[PDB]
Amino acid sequence: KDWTQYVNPLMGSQSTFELSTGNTYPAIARPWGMNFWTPQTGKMGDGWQYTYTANKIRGFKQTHQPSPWINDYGQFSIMPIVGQPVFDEEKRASWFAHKGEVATPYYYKVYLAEHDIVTEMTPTERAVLFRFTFPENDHSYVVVDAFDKGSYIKIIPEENKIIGYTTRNSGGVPENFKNYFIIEFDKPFTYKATVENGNLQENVAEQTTDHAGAIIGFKTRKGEQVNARIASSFISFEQAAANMNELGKDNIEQLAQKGKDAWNQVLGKIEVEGGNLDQYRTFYSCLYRSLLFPRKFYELDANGQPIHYSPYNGQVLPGYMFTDTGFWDTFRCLFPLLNLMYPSVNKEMQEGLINTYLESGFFPEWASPGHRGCMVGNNSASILVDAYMKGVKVDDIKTLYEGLIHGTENVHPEVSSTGRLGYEYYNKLGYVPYDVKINENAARTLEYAYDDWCIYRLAKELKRPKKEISLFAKRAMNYKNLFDKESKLMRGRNEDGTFQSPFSPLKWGDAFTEGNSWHYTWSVFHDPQGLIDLMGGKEMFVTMMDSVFAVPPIFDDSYYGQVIHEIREMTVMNMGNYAHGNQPIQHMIYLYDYAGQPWKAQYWLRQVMDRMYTPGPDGYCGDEDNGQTSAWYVFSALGFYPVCPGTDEYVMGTPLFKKATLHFENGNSLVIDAPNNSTENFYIDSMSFNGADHTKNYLRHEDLFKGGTIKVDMSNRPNLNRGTKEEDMPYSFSKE
């Protein structure tokens, strides 16, 4: 059975600075691969390294980039050309068309029209094989570009080899940062030149310079194939040579089959059927995008044991390491998806986090590859705790707990999004104030309160002193400190305790991030009942919820002075103020379940799935955000979602397919059977779990893992009675 046929690596590529439909590039890679490869249409340095509307490719590039905003590191490219040996990234570039291109996760091919050259590539976790098919020509070349900001290159003709290192990066790296690469050709060089700050230096073997490059060449006959085996390491040249062994002596066809198999192994853990082709493509493309980040950042020693270059301190050290994710995005459902479907993989990642804390003094929030200043919150706490409570348990629990506590009373001296900026005010006042020069203060406070609930959970589980458990149980309620009873919304609060005026509920940023009050107010994952209580009961809560959808997409952009692309993206979708791309709001629709109206979740969730995601190049309604926006679709299509990681619950939405089968790593399987599902029948009339009537609006992790059958009776009419009882409600801390 193949699922890769449904994966479109071009989904999200039709994006620009001005307007996102995913801001992705085609990651040709193994799952969680250390090195990704992509065709490169953008100029060196441009975060938009591949865009669908671009006409020319100027290299095939090794990349580690998680988003255009974060940008790249450990990057170099290769480009086959004919005619004159030219290094310049414009002069060497070639027209292509998407109809001369084949993009899959395990194999990429393109016809370079201006050189009459076909390029094919098939990666492994750390290496890749290139096959170039050249035309008849006296002057055929391959250009190797080590990029700028200080690089190195060496041509070794007696070995048909080129080695080099690249350092261009976007921050978050140690001083000794390098990515060492080795390229072996199966055709010997008849022409050889290094490049030094744009000057071709024929027969000069080596360069150490700002922007090193190499051009080798030969005569080719029509249809002549030249293969290049490439690997890189963050450790050393000898380690890169070891990494090359992943290629064995395989050809393109053999490596493509191994990558296809690797992908089918992970994609095939979730088998959907009884939908249409657009849905299959959307689903598996989103699943593919959910299994890329964070990437492996470890390599294998002579004994097959993991070692890694430390992006935190520059040492080479034993153990697992992963990077390139922002927990502000990925705590929400991306990491939970791994705890459900791929826990063995998150086990490695969690050990990597322990290594991050050991190496750098902090758990990461945004890492690429080292600590990076981006977004907000202490959501590493959610990641660590959710794993543990779901049985993904690190070896050194003591260090894990100490790391967590460390993060509640420290902020990283250089990277303000690492640790807790404003923790002094928060610990003292119960909130980060609006008028103390700490922006995003309300968003930080709300996420910290949830984060402290996660810590409370773990402290209780670990049998910590009652004094510690009480501290964090109290901090978990800090969300109440920003609730404005007058507007029924969250509101920035001055240091002196008064709420800030004038108050603008539609103003994006400022007190919040990636949205306004209407978007962030719902960020009480651990205590929705508490929020319902604050607003005066379930009827008023639903009145407020419903109003998000019913109003026009009006906004206040005065924080920015202009309509930023995230605001534009909301305005065009015809969903009121529900801006699906803003991460803080993505769990929102599930909250209808907690207010006794699950049928409203069913209605709106289905609207989002049918309208906000498409399988084409312009697929997503905003940035994909390293798996979070994709994993949202994966979960929601199955019919449930981890509103509150750290609990064992998935909150019920509405399934998209007539049938979905989950295959768990523990060897058990779960069938979600919804035979009456259709475009019209998106309401849950009733539901059973292994035959037992199930009116609850949540499912438990442990019960799913036991396997069996969930049967969902789908209807075109809402069932106004199902899921409204007290015992049907998912978890709230206030009730606990």
Q: Which residues bind Ca ion (CB under 5 A)?
A: 581, 583, 623
Could you tell me the smallest distance in angstroms from the CB atom of residue 654 to Ca ion?
23
Check whether 628 is labelled as a binding-site residue: no
How distant, in Å, are the alpha carbons of 61, 203, 289 from that of 193? 20, 5, 39
Could you tell me the smallest distance in angstroms from the CB atom of residue 689 to Ca ion?
33
Which CB, 343 or 622, lies closer to Ca ion? 622
Which CB, 205 or 572, lies closer to Ca ion? 572
How distant, in Å, are the alpha carbons of 52, 54, 112, 606 from that of 11? 9, 15, 22, 21
Confirm if 722 and 686 have CB atoms less than 8 A apart.
yes
Which CB, 585 or 660, lies closer to Ca ion? 585
Which CB, 20 or 597, lies closer to Ca ion? 20
Check whether 461 is labelled as a binding-site residue: no
3-state class percentages of the chain: helix first, strand second, coil last, to nearest 5 = 30, 25, 45
Which CB, 31 or 581, lies closer to Ca ion? 581
Which CB, 569 or 648, lies closer to Ca ion? 569
Could you tell me the smallest distance in angstroms from the CB atom of residue 205 to Ca ion?
48
Kindly report the number of other CB atoms within 10 A of residue 463's CB atom.
Answer: 8
Check whether 619 is labelled as a binding-site residue: no
Could you tell me the smallest distance in angstroms from the CB atom of residue 628 to Ca ion?
8
Q: Locate the DSSP E strands across 475-569.
A: 483-484, 489-490
- Residue 457, H or E segment: helix 441-461
Residue partners of 95: CB distance under 8 A and separation at least 6: 55, 56, 112, 113, 114
Which CB, 452 or 625, lies closer to Ca ion? 625
Q: Give the pair of three-digit tokens for residue 172.
A: 């978050």
How distant, in Å, are the alpha carbons of 35, 149, 365, 394, 395 from that of 401? 32, 40, 16, 11, 12
Q: Locate the DSSP E strands across 322-397.
A: 322-323, 325-326, 366-367
Could you tell me the smallest distance in angstroms from the CB atom of residue 581 to Ca ion?
4
Q: Which of 87, 698, 15, 650 is nearest to 341 (CA)?
A: 650
Q: Which of 454, 440, 377 is nearest to 411 (CA)?
A: 377
Which CB, 204 or 564, lies closer to Ca ion? 564
Could you tell me the smallest distance in angstroms from the CB atom of residue 716 to Ca ion?
32
Bridge partners (DSSP) of residue 230 are 128, 183
Check whether 514 is labelled as a binding-site residue: yes
Q: Give the pair of three-digit tokens for residue 622.
A: 């905003």
- Residue 58, H or E segment: none
Helix (H, G, I), strand (E, B) or coil at 658: coil
Could you tell me the smallest distance in angstroms from the CB atom of residue 577 to Ca ion?
15
Which CB, 621 or 643, lies closer to Ca ion? 621
Could you tell me the smallest distance in angstroms from the CB atom of residue 70 to Ca ion?
13
Q: What angle do CA 487, 490, 495 make, to 5 degrees?
A: 110
Which CB, 451 or 623, lies closer to Ca ion? 623
Which CB, 451 or 566, lies closer to Ca ion? 566
Which CB, 566 or 649, lies closer to Ca ion? 566
**20-53 b/e with 16+ CB inside 10 Å = b?**
bbbbbbbbbbbbbbbbbbbbbbbebeebbbbbbe
- Residue 684, H or E segment: strand 683-689
| Position closest to Ca ion via CB | 581
Which CB, 117 or 443, lies closer to Ca ion? 443
- CA distance linking residue 406 with residue 410, whole number of Å: 6
- Residue 401, H or E segment: helix 397-408
Q: Give the pair of three-digit tokens for residue 510.
A: 């400022």
Could you tell me the smallest distance in angstroms from the CB atom of residue 627 to Ca ion?
12
Could you tell me the smallest distance in angstroms from the CB atom of residue 583 to Ca ion?
5
One-letter amino acid for residue 205 of the chain: A
Q: Which of 305, 306, 288, 285 is nearest to 296 (CA)?
A: 306
Could you tell me the smallest distance in angstroms from the CB atom of residue 374 to Ca ion?
12
Confirm if 199 and 213 have CB atoms less than 8 A apart.
no
Q: Locate the DSSP E strands across 56-150.
A: 56-57, 59-63, 76-82, 94-95, 101-104, 107-112, 117-123, 127-134, 137-145
Could you tell me the smallest distance in angstroms from the CB atom of residue 520 to Ca ion?
13
Could you tell me the smallest distance in angstroms from the CB atom of residue 517 to Ca ion?
17
One-letter amino acid for residue 60 of the chain: F
Helix (H, G, I), strand (E, B) or coil at 299: strand
Sort strands 708-715 and 669-673 into parallel, antiparallel or unpaired.
Answer: parallel
List the binding residues for Ca(2+).
329, 514, 581-583, 625
Binding residue positions: 329, 514, 581-583, 625
